[PDB]
């Protein structure tokens, strides 16, 4: 819809028999339109060859026409590669949409402040409770691994990349004497293990 292009003066005012159709005509056949707009329709407004504004595909222009003239002009201009549009001027159609655009954008930012605060906060406590439930797991599995008594010592670690397998085999050497038989160690390592990555 023509926001900053069409206005009130373009359309006919207090019209008794006419209707202004914004028949866009490109420059490829603009002389054609201004010369045979009478052929396109009988009982037409003389000197109605008026051009309003410019755009990259064509040039907006309007024609004032009796009702039967609008029928005939549309009928013989659709084939003439002219865009047909019976637009009605409505300042509200422009002002409303732009007002909602600006107000919704500003309110969305004013509410997105709270979004980021709430989100980062709640995720921080989520990760706190996350590591807490992970420690609870560590406790449960370390306990059942060693039976009833809860005596164990936990530790974070950060192996060097490409040195992983050497650490695996040396720790296997370290911890395989705890059980001295089998602790195919795979998932259930001879140590109570859990994995985390960011």
């Amino acid at each position: 819809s023509l926001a900053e292009i069409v206005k009130k003066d373009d359309f006919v005012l207090d019209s008794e028999y006419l209707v202004t159709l914004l028949v866009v005509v490109p420059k490829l056949n603009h002389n054609d339109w201004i010369k045979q707009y009478e052929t396109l329709a009988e009982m037409v407004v003389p000197r109605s060859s008026n051009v309003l504004s410019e755009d990259q595909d064509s040039y907006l222009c309007n024609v004032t026409l009796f009702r039967k003239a609008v029928d005939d002009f549309r009928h013989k201009a659709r084939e003439n590669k002219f865009i047909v549009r019976d637009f009605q001027y409505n300042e509200e159609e422009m002002k409303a949409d732009k007002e909602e655009m600006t107000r919704l954008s500003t309110d969305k930012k004013k509410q997105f402040g709270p979004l980021v605060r709430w989100l980062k906060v709640n995720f921080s406590e989520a990760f706190i409770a996350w590591i807490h439930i992970k420690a609870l797991r560590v406790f449960v599995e370390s306990v059942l691994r060693y039976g009833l008594p809860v005596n164990f010592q936990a530790m974070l670690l950060q192996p060097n990349k490409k040195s992983v397998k050497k650490l695996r085999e040396v720790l296997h050497e370290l911890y395989k004497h705890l059980d001295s038989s089998a602790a195919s160690q795979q998932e259930y390592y001879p140590y109570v293990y859990y994995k985390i990555d960011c």
């Binding site: 028999y17 201004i34 009478e38 009982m43 037409v44 407004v45 003389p46 000197r47 060859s49």
Partner: protein
């Protein structure tokens, strides 16, 4: 550019039949003025006639 010739054609034709149909509509309103004149003079005062005749 149809210009002043077609301007005068549109003006004369449109204003001509506007004025014509205007005149016949006004004269039809005048004919209905005659109709309501006669109907009132033969109906409303006639109900008055019936009332006063019953009175007498």
């Amino acid at each position: 550019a149809l210009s002043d010739a077609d301007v005068q054609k549109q003006i004369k034709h449109m204003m001509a039949f506007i004025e014509q149909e205007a005149n016949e509509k006004a004269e039809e309103i005048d004919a209905k003025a005659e109709e309501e004149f006669n109907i009132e003079k033969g109906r409303l005062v006639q109900t008055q006639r019936l009332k006063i005749m019953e009175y007498y």
